[PDB]
């Protein structure tokens, strides 16, 4: 029902399994817990939010909002999004 993702810096983001399955990389990483030796906190929190975002807005008339990304975070996120395929 829930899983845990652990950032390179210790922090634990506990999230729904389907939300996490969004990322194929993650899926494969269970089948529990995923440690992510390469993704800092300011980056995995945004990922999880993205899962929430995707999961809610996929298959939906109700006008969709911009997913937002602060500048400083963009590179790191792009690298994470790419490792994780999402």
């Amino acid at each position: 029902m829930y899983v845990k993702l652990i950032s390179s810096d210790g922090h634990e983001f506990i999230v729904k399994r389907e939300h996490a399955l969004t990322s194929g990389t993650i899926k494969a990483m269970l089948s529990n817990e995923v440690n992510f030796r390469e993704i800092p906190s300011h980056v995995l929190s945004k990922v999880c939010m993205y899962f929430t975002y995707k999961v809610r807005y996929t298959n939906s008339s109700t006008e969709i909002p911009e997913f937002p990304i602060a500048p400083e975070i963009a590179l790191e996120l792009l690298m994470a999004a790419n490792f994780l395929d999402c």
Binding site: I64, E66, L77, A81
Partner: protein, 142 residues
């Protein structure tokens, strides 16, 4: 993959439910893309077009893809007893990667773009600007 030659008027309307300056793109009889004047974010516009015609919509400044009535291909259908067909233009749920390119592409001049530290395969992706011609071929193979 072309607009059908009419010749039956169709009252259409483009609501821009998006947060970008939308660019209507009409698909000629030959299959070429015709740009129409842009639609700012909240706004809308009454258009005459024709049953059978092909329209798509992109971010006018960076050509990112947008949905109309939840697909990419808008076919002005029969108007009859009812007046305008509605053309709701929305963001899709972009992949987080695509989403990332988007900011990134827009915070650095691709002129200046070599000098940022990241895998080079990543650097090709950023160079790989989304494109009507592209998606036009992409949206062709179905």
């Amino acid at each position: 993959l072309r607009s059908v030659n009419s010749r039956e008027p169709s009252q259409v309307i483009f609501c821009n439910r998006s947060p970008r300056v939308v660019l209507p793109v009409w698909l000629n009889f030959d299959g070429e893309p015709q740009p129409y004047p842009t639609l700012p974010p909240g706004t809308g516009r009454r258009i005459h077009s024709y049953r059978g015609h092909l329209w798509l919509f992109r971010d006018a400044g960076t050509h990112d893809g947008l949905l109309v009535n939840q697909t990419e291909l808008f076919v002005p259908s029969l108007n009859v007893d009812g007046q305008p067909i509605f053309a709701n233009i929305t963001l899709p749920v972009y992949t987080l990667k695509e989403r990332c390119l988007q900011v990134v592409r827009s915070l650095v001049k691709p002129e200046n773009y070599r000098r940022l530290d990241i895998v080079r395969s990543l650097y090709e992706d950023l160079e790989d600007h989304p494109n009507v011609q592209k998606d036009l071929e992409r949206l062709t193979q179905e």
